[PDB]
Design a binder for this molecule. Structure first.
Ligand SMILES: C[C@]12CCC(=O)C=C1CC[C@@H]1[C@@H]2CC[C@]2(C)C(=O)CC[C@@H]12
Ligand SMILES: C[C@]12CCC(=O)C=C1CC[C@@H]1[C@@H]2CC[C@]2(C)C(=O)CC[C@@H]12
Lengths: 221, 221
């Protein structure tokens, strides 16, 4: 038909969780890579960015900005946001938990090199001492395979995405957390998620020196 | 039903947008004020707080934490989150912009004395040239009295709530936005809002030296 169109640079950044979520719902999409500050300026000058920033997603006849606005729409549309307002409330509480950790991780590669040790240390402590216990507690409490309502929701996808990033930063962090380890395998084995994990998918690589410099120019810092 | 129960200290912080939104929907609520570090850790130890943080609200048999999850639940329950998925996307996009500036203002009194003049200046520039233009544009484009679907939603409440704080910080910032000026008066004259704006309501004051030191000891900074 008309595929969702993703407006971002060729990095993870704030678009990566939208990619995951779209792939987990079986949704094929297109990416229009911003390659320069001039490209970003175009979308601004045209009036397509309500707050002058990307991510912007063209979907279902709307140009959506703001990551949470985009992710909420996809999750509602593709039934990954709970069956009722009470499940939705548990989903929202958990994913906001996930985003707390998610944001520290996203910001890490853009931090000054004379800060990166302490920031990762802060991710280490929060992850082991607080956030991983919270999610393990949830799974232990119901003994079910999904976070909410005994059914795949966005929270499983958001948490597993995050597990792959935690995995890369410090592989020991998940070690004392068995149900988290098992959630990760089971979700990785879902057909849609299995496909996105394959080489050549729109799953993006971690930041490196070259993209960091690309980003400096595009986003002007 | 029960009265919803709000756990927080007697300050605005992250609970204040939840008080506004409950008041606007005409919901009576109870506040159990945290007055020490000990009241807060008791909450933690009793397992009331998923991520060991407030705001927390007891509502409909849940101990909901994370400001966005509480807000989304209340808004959906009281029909303030739009009529359908597409009106929800518009609302989500709007409120996240409103929260981007909202966050600047919320964090402001907690910044170091020597940062505060630059922090304010950034709030003034972003207000004048990015956020107020954005919502003045919305109103001009549809010609209606409300931001979304010609009907009161949470976006009206959160924005007007925000216009009150911008007035505290700099009364001139709104002077060039006649449609924003008019929205505030309409919304403020609404009977739930008018009541919550009266003396002795649950509405909270600006931070002062004393609530700042209270917060240092409760939240520990
Ligand atoms: C604002 C910011 C954080 C504070 C800082 O120190 C430097 C930057 C500049 C790059 C921003 C980043 C935040 C996250 C952004 C938006 C992305 O996901 C792509 C580029 C990146
Ligand atoms: C983290 C923080 C900002 C960064 C900073 O400079 C100092 C603090 C300490 C208190 C936090 C605040 C964020 C907003 C919080 C959660 C409230 O609404 C009440 C207490 C307060």
């Amino acid at each position: 038909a008309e595929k969702p169109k993703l407006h971002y640079s060729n990095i993870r950044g704030r678009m990566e969780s939208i990619r995951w979520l779209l792939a987990a719902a079986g949704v094929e999409f297109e990416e229009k890579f911003i390659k320069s500050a001039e490209d970003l300026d175009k979308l601004r000058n045209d009036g397509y960015l309500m707050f002058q920033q990307v991510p912007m997603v063209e979907i279902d006849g709307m140009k959506l900005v703001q990551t949470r606005a985009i992710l909420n729409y996809i999750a509602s549309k593709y039934n990954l946001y709970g069956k009722d307002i009470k499940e939705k409330a548990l989903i929202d509480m958990y994913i906001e938990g996930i985003a707390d950790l998610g944001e520290m991780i996203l910001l890490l590669p853009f931090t000054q090199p004379e800060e990166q040790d302490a920031k990762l240390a802060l991710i280490q402590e929060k992850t082991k001492n607080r956030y991983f216990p919270a999610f393990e507690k949830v799974l232990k409490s119901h003994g079910q395979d999904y976070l909410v309502g005994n059914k795949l929701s966005r929270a499983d996808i958001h948490l597993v995405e995050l597990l792959y990033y935690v995995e890369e930063l410090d592989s020991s962090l998940i070690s004392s957390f068995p149900l988290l380890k098992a959630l990760k395998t089971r979700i990785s084995n879902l057909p849609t998620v299995k496909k996105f994990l394959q080489p050549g998918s729109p799953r993006k690589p971690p930041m490196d020196e070259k993209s960091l410099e690309e980003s400096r120019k595009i986003f002007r810092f």
